[PDB]
Amino acid sequence: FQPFQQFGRDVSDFTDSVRDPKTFEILDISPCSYGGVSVITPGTNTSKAVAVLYQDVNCTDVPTMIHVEQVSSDWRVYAFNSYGNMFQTQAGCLVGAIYENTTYECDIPIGAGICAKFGSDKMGQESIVAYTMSIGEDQSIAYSNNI
Amino acid sequence: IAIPTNFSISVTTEVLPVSMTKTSVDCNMYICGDSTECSNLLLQYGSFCTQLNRALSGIAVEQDRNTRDVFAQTKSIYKTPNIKDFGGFNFSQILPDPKKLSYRSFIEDLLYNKVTLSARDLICAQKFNGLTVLPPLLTDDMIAAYTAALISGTATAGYTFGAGAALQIPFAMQMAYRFNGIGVTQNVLYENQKQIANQFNNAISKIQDSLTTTSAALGKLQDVINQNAVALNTLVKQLSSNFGAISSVLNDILSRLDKVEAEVQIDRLITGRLQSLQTYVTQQLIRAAEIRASANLAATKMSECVLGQSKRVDFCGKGYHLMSFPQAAPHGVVFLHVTYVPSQQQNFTTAPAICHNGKAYFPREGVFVMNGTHWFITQRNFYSPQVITTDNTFESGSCDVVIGIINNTVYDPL
Amino acid sequence: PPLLTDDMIAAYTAALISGTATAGYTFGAGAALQIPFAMQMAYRFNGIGVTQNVLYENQKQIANQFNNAISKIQDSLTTTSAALGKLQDVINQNAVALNTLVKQLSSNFGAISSVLNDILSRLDKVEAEVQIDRLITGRLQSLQTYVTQQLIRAAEIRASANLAATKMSECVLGQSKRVDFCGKGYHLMSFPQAAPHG
Amino acid sequence: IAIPTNFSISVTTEVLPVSMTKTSVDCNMYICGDSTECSNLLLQYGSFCT
Numbered sequence: 001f002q003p004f005q006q007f008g009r010d011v012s013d014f015t016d017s018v019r020d021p022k023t024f025e026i027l028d029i030s031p032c033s034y035g036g037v038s039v040i041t042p043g044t045n046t047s048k049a050v051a052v053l054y055q056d057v058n059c060t061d062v063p064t065m066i067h068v069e070q071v072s073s074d075w076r077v078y079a080f081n082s083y084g085n086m087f088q089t090q091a092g093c094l095v096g097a098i099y100e101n102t103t104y105e106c107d108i109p110i111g112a113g114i115c116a117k118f119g120s121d122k123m124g125q126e127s128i129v130a131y132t133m134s135i136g137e138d139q140s141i142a143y144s145n146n147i
Numbered sequence: 148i149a150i151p152t153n154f155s156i157s158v159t160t161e162v163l164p165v166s167m168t169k170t171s172v173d174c175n176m177y178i179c180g181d182s183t184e185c186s187n188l189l190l191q192y193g194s195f196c197t198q199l200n201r202a203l204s205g206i207a208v209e210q211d212r213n214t215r216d217v218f219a220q221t222k223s224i225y226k227t228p229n230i231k232d233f234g235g236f237n238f239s240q241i242l243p244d245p246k247k248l249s250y251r252s253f254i255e256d257l258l259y260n261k262v263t264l265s266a267r268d269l270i271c272a273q274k275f276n277g278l279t280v281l282p283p284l285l286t287d288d289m290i291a292a293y294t295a296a297l298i299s300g301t302a303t304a305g306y307t308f309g310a311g312a313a314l315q316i317p318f319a320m321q322m323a324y325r326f327n328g329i330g331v332t333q334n335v336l337y338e339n340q341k342q343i344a345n346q347f348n349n350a351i352s353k354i355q356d357s358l359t360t361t362s363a364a365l366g367k368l369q370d371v372i373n374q375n376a377v378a379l380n381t382l383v384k385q386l387s388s389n390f391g392a393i394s395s396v397l398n399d400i401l402s403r404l405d406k407v408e409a410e411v412q413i414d415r416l417i418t419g420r421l422q423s424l425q426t427y428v429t430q431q432l433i434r435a436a437e438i439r440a441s442a443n444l445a446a447t448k449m450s451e452c453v454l455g456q457s458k459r460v461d462f463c464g465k466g467y468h469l470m471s472f473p474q475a476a477p478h479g480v481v482f483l484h485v486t487y488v489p490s491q492q493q494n495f496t497t498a499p500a501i502c503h504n505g506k507a508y509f510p511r512e513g514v515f516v517m518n519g520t521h522w523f524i525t526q527r528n529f530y531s532p533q534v535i536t537t538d539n540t541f542e543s544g545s546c547d548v549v550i551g552i553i554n555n556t557v558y559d560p561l
Numbered sequence: 562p563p564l565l566t567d568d569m570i571a572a573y574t575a576a577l578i579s580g581t582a583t584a585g586y587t588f589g590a591g592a593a594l595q596i597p598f599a600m601q602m603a604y605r606f607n608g609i610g611v612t613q614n615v616l617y618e619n620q621k622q623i624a625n626q627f628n629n630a631i632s633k634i635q636d637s638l639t640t641t642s643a644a645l646g647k648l649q650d651v652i653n654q655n656a657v658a659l660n661t662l663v664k665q666l667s668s669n670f671g672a673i674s675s676v677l678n679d680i681l682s683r684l685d686k687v688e689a690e691v692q693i694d695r696l697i698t699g700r701l702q703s704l705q706t707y708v709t710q711q712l713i714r715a716a717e718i719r720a721s722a723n724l725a726a727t728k729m730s731e732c733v734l735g736q737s738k739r740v741d742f743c744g745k746g747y748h749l750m751s752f753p754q755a756a757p758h759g
Numbered sequence: 760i761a762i763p764t765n766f767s768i769s770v771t772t773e774v775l776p777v778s779m780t781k782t783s784v785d786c787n788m789y790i791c792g793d794s795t796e797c798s799n800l801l802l803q804y805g806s807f808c809t
């Protein structure tokens with residue numbers, strides 16, 4: 001800052017920094033809930049089970065950007081890797097859904113070639129799974145000069 | 148009359164946008180900066196923001212629908228053959244390489260970095276005010292796989308795999324069928340196959356020089372990227388407007404005035420920011436309509452020129468259309484149209500009909516052309532003179548009244 | 562003013578007409594190739610499906626019927642004044658939209674007057690603000706509505722111009738086999754004529 | 760079956776618009792005019808006119 005600067009503004013004209021009046025140090029201000037959060041569900045008539053997708057953050061520091069120390073009690077199970085359900089995607093990560101290797105037809109689009117659906121053939125009958133969508137199947141037609 | 152005696156093979160390249168970027172907005176972060184006494188005032192305005200969210204969600208769904216409609220045409224991907232012995236035609240430049248570092252062909256690699264998708268950065272200012280960008284559903288690897296399955300499958304199975312099952316056919320016989328579909332016989336192919344292959348191989352290679360050194364050939368596809376960035380940058384700068392209030396910051400108003408005098412100046416900021424959001428949604432809808440029209444044109448071009456041979460004049464290329472090759476591009480598609488154009492010409496004297504011994508004779512699929520000594524018959528698109536027989540002509544009527552008829556004999560094989 | 566004056570558009574149409582007749586349709590796909598007009602018409606008749614026999618035996622009848630079918634357009638255009646309404650409403654809409662925008666300046670928008678001079682000469686600087694902001698917002702809204710309607714009309718005209726461009730590309734310098742794309746019966750040839758804004 | 764024995768040649772006229780008139784506007788003389796007291800006030804509304 002300048003020697004007489006007291007607060008710093010942004011291009012959209014809001015304070016993102018301030019100088020503490022007692023101890024002359026600089027502090028940053030950011031919104032305490034910024035960034036998108038998406039909830040993936042089947043129908044409410046179907047059994048209630050949701051998955052939470054964080055948009056553009058890594059998922060080794062979800063509790064940093066969600067402030068788990070003051071969030072509600074039922075939100076802590078969607079911000080930790082106690083169960084094997086937190087896996088990282090290209091469009092963020094999914095909490096509450098298990099990954100599958102077999103490709104299917106897309107049901108609930110998520111992004112970056114990853115979809116979701118209710119139920120599985122693995123036992124799991126109420127948990128929702130996440131998979132990579134399929135674009136068809138291999139055919140491998142053969143070429144010859146006189147056929 | 149003028150009839151060509153030679154021809155050349157050219158490759159034409161055009162681009163057209165297919166989809167644009169998907170965006171999302173949050174009113175409770177844009178209109179108010181985490182002010183619990185601004186959310187209550189915003190709540191008494193109705194369901195404008197649900198309308199904006201539904202409009203933006205519809206645009207985002209339509210953007211994925213466009214790229215699903217354009218590229219997904221076969222629903223059965225074909226494995227790329229390791230050999231490229233297609234009768235002398237080199238398909239290595241438009242097909243993905245074996246043991247490839249990047250999962251796409253060389254031409255779409257060369258045009259991927261030709262366009263650019265991209266500390267007081269504007270991205271953090273957009274993120275702090277609820278402006279986010281959603282990734283597309285189909286990644287570029289699947290689009291490259293779709294284009295590769297179209298290419299390997301157009302070359303090794305003809306155009307018939309787009310209407311029914313795939314039929315195996317040699318490449319040269321397909322070339323003869325397409326040449327016959329132009330109007331010229333399947334004679335200039337088999338007698339000049341090496342010339343056709345050698346001219347096609349460097350007509351393909353000239354696209355590398357036409358795309359690498361020369362710029363501004365993908366400006367239509369760069370403007371789509373630029374417009375979203377300009378519209379998002381001009382929206383975050385409207386937050387620094389008074390709109391008739393004492394300040395552009397809600398914290399300056401709320402800390403300096405009591406609660407009763409606060410609404411009369413908060414309302415002006417709320418109305419101005421709502422008007423800015425209305426405007427942004429309006430040009431987003433209009434641009435989405437234009438992109439939808441362009442994507443429909445790209446889809447019908449994909450259907451009619453890659454999966455078949457089109458007889459419509461100047462729909463895919465300049466001259467007589469033979470085939471097309473699709474190439475993946477960021478937010479668009481690139482078409483490589485192979486056409487047939489005649490090059491040289493030579494003057495000739497022609498006649499409408501020939502009266503042999505009182506009966507007129509008219510040609511079929513050709514014209515009457517003499518070379519200086521006697522008369523022949525030849526096709527219009529290539530100078531291939533043939534002797535006039537009774538099979539090349541048909542008797543019809545009398546020769547007493549035909550404008551410009553001449554006297555000549557007709558060969559009888561008996 | 563437009564960049565292309567009407568003389569240059571007329572020159573473009575004349576260069577299309579002289580070149581469609583003396584060189585066939587092949588001038589647009591490659592170089593121009595010379596061909597007599599009777600042989601070109603016989604080739605087009607063969608492209609319809611009828612053999613190239615009914616032309617050479619009836620050429621005078623074809624010419625005589627073409628020459629007065631063309632001349633009937635003189636009576637079809639000179640008397641009737643409803644064929645170019647699609648070309649006249651485009652002219653009318655811009656004039657109506659420009660005239661209705663200049664008449665919005667005579668509205669109060671909740672202020673004491675529609676004139677800035679009446680407000681500024683009767684009120685001090687502190688309370689002229691709240692009554693000039695209403696006029697500013699009303700005039701800004703009046704401009705924004707006009708811009709949005711102009712954008713929508715521009716999209717419509719762009720679609721119509723794309724249709725005109727593909728019709729010119731497929732029917733003037735080519736013969737189209739699509740049903741009812743150019744005419745009613747079996748298409749033989751087309752001739753473009755320049756028009757104001759169309 | 761029915762087969763024609765004669766034919767006629769017709770000329771069809773169809774019209775369609777290509778372009779409209781180009782227009783331009785100036786905010787500073789539409790919203791205010793020559794009043795400099797409200798030019799500064801229009802300056803506080805942002806970049807709508809751009």
Ligand SMILES: *[C@@H]1O[C@H](CO)[C@@H](O)[C@H](O)[C@H]1NC(C)=O
Nearest residue numbers: 019020021022023024025026
């Ligand atoms: C203000 O007073 C506090 C209390 O002792 C002290 O810690 C701080 O250093 C002071 N700041 C000054 C003198 O700038």
Ligand SMILES: *[C@@H]1O[C@H](CO)[C@@H](O)[C@H](O)[C@H]1NC(C)=O
Nearest residue numbers: 042043044045046047048118
């Ligand atoms: C849930 O779905 C079942 C099966 O269609 C239906 O019978 C039931 O009525 C639904 N529940 C409600 C509350 O409508």
Ligand SMILES: *[C@@H]1O[C@H](CO)[C@@H](O)[C@H](O)[C@H]1NC(C)=O
Nearest residue numbers: 056057058059060061088092
């Ligand atoms: C997320 O993790 C990846 C790999 O661990 C790293 O490359 C990237 O920089 C990380 N992003 C952030 C925002 O920390």
Ligand SMILES: *[C@@H]1O[C@H](CO)[C@@H](O)[C@H](O)[C@H]1NC(C)=O
Nearest residue numbers: 098099100101102103122132
């Ligand atoms: C699924 O794929 C992953 C990654 O390729 C692999 O580690 C795993 O063994 C596979 N099978 C199962 C059942 O997860």
Ligand SMILES: *[C@@H]1O[C@H](CO)[C@@H](O)[C@H](O)[C@H]1NC(C)=O
Nearest residue numbers: 152153154155342346490491
């Ligand atoms: C036709 O043009 C090609 C390319 O210039 C040339 O190689 C060939 O010899 C030409 N044909 C004749 C008959 O001259």
Ligand SMILES: *[C@@H]1O[C@H](CO)[C@@H](O)[C@H](O)[C@H]1NC(C)=O
Nearest residue numbers: 231232235236237238239240
């Ligand atoms: C095809 O083009 C590549 C490009 O370098 C070349 O190496 C190759 O020899 C050409 N021919 C074949 C049959 O691959």
Ligand SMILES: *[C@@H]1O[C@H](CO)[C@@H](O)[C@H](O)[C@H]1NC(C)=O
Nearest residue numbers: 148149491492493494495595
């Ligand atoms: C054909 O004749 C025209 C004039 O009648 C002439 O301009 C043209 O050059 C001639 N073509 C050739 C190939 O000599």
Ligand SMILES: *[C@@H]1O[C@H](CO)[C@@H](O)[C@H](O)[C@H]1NC(C)=O
Nearest residue numbers: 517518519520521522523532
């Ligand atoms: C015309 O063709 C005939 C038959 O091929 C040939 O004998 C004659 O020399 C040719 N004349 C010219 C001028 O090319």
Ligand SMILES: *[C@@H]1O[C@H](CO)[C@@H](O)[C@H](O)[C@H]1NC(C)=O
Nearest residue numbers: 502504505551552553554555
């Ligand atoms: C063709 O021959 C007939 C008689 O054999 C003659 O009357 C007629 O004039 C000739 N036509 C031409 C064009 O020389």
Ligand SMILES: *[C@@H]1O[C@H](CO)[C@@H](O)[C@H](O)[C@H]1NC(C)=O
Nearest residue numbers: 619622626764765766767768
């Ligand atoms: C066909 O119609 C034209 C125009 O009415 C007429 O002149 C001609 O005689 C008709 N043909 C026959 C065979 O009647």
